Amino acid sequence: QYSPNTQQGRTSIVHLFEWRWVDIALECERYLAPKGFGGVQVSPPNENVAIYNPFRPWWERYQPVSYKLCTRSGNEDEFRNMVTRCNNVGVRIYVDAVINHMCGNAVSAGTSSTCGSYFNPGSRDFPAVPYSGWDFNDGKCKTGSGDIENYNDATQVRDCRLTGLLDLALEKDYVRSKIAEYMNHLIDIGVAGFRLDASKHMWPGDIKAILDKLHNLNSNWFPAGSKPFIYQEVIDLGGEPIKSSDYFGNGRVTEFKYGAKLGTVIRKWNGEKMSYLKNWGEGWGFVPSDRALVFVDSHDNQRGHGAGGASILTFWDARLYKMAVGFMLAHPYGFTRVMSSYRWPRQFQNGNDVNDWVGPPNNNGVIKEVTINPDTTCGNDWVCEHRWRQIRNMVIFRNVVDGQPFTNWYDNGSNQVAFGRGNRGFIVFNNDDWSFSLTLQTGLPAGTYCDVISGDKINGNCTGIKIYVSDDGKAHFSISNSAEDPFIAIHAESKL
Ligand SMILES: C[C@H]1O[C@H](O[C@H]2[C@H](O)[C@@H](O)[C@@H](O[C@H]3[C@H](O)[C@@H](O)[C@@H](O)O[C@@H]3CO)O[C@@H]2CO)[C@H](O)[C@@H](O)[C@@H]1N[C@H]1C=C(CO)[C@@H](O[C@H]2O[C@H](CO)[C@@H](O[C@H]3O[C@H](CO)[C@@H](O)[C@H](O)[C@H]3O)[C@H](O)[C@H]2O)[C@H](O)[C@H]1O
Ligand SMILES: *[C@@H]1O[C@H](CO)[C@@H](O)[C@H](O)[C@H]1NC(C)=O
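Above: query sequence and acarbose derived hexasaccharide SMILES. Below: predicted holo structure tokens.
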């Protein structure tokens, strides 16, 4: 469960949020594989409700109608083509598995689904699966509204409807089998693992029963006995009866405290300062590193739809965001997930964004293709943070230093810190309102290194800042609080 099943040497996955299958296939071949990315988290590949009011929101994909691989991202043929091509180039595919529920109980019956499948939420009828009233938790939930009302009651959190979403009776073998059937179809197609959506809303034991029904990975691409990588979306910020540790037996869990705390520290909110990150990791009350799936922001909380709130850093806060992602990718804690989003017209009214529902770039509901500009950035409103030099290079930094211990820490008692990863990498940050100019012990072998944040190493030369490491392993670093990116990173492979 716990192993990503990524090709050796690749240490991160990227969430290509709302991308079309054909675009992801191309991205695997033209960018992801060459750049060392380990895999891609795709949006739900199963048929969902087509919601027109609001107009095709991103969240309509979290309201299943059937398990037919037919969505705005493409059909099954296109999906299989994507998995095959990505696998052939060593980039894994992780499917966002929405198995906790079906669509909203209030959704109108009809064929307003991404594949034309008929469904009647009112009568609990989903013939395309098929599911009926006996397959839901309506009779098991004890709240007056039928929805989840109190998170202090671990039971209703699991048996009731999350914001109205029809709750599947996961204790039933029939339902467990229909879900496993769907997941095995994908595993045999070639996917390497799954993001279990709303895992907090499922009993650890029900999830385990489903996983036990899963096949080993497709033997045409994976070694015998390979089990699917599982990461469970459990929002545990403490203070609730449900703990993410209860899910350790099924696989990894998303550590949402990670992004929220890194956000307040980097924003320097209420006394926080980077010097405190000296013992970042379990030392901050996070889950064990070998069970953690970490990230700075996710599709959910980058738009206020998840835990983290205001402290969360997103592409909107470019400068601080790159620094946050940089720290995450350099630090040994957890398995890292990189976000890749699209721009939407944020409309803040009384502190909140009224356009947080806006779906991906589209033409009359048809998702726009991801166009690559000559500078390698994306068009059609796709942000493509994974293509930002500072981020992409830190993705490589992680691959390069994989295995190396956290060493040579330094901090000025405020917001200027630095540390290395064995003798394969070193990173320095300046988040103070004054310049940083100091000679530090890097632990790297003497030589000239290209700073991978400001530039790239391009055949015996750096296009950006260069750092000179002496025989001592010492090197001078100068970072002005006015720098575009107030941090420097060098590693064994950016060595001239
Ligand atoms: C959104 C999160 O809500 C909880 O997350 C809980 C959290 O577990 C709890 O601890 C507390 O958090 C608290 C913190 O504990 C507290 O410390 C402080 O920080 O405040 C937080 C709340 O902001 O509340 C939140 C929100 O209910 C779950 O635990 C977590 O699993 C979930 N995330 C996943 C699940 C779903 C659902 O299928 C998706 O929803 C997404 O699709 C849904 C279905 O289309 C959308 O509903 C949409 O359709 C429904 C129809 O039934 C409508 O009733 C609803 O008004 C509409 O917005 C939803 O807006 C969207 O976010 C997400 O994209 C996906 O990533
Ligand atoms: C490095 O760049 C300089 C020009 O800035 C050039 O003289 C030199 O040939 C380049 N070295 C290599 C190995 O391309």
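Residues 59-60, 62-63, 104, 151, 162-165, 197-198, 200, 233, 235, 237, 240, 300, 305-307, 309 surround acarbose derived hexasaccharide (ligand 1) (CB under 6 Å).
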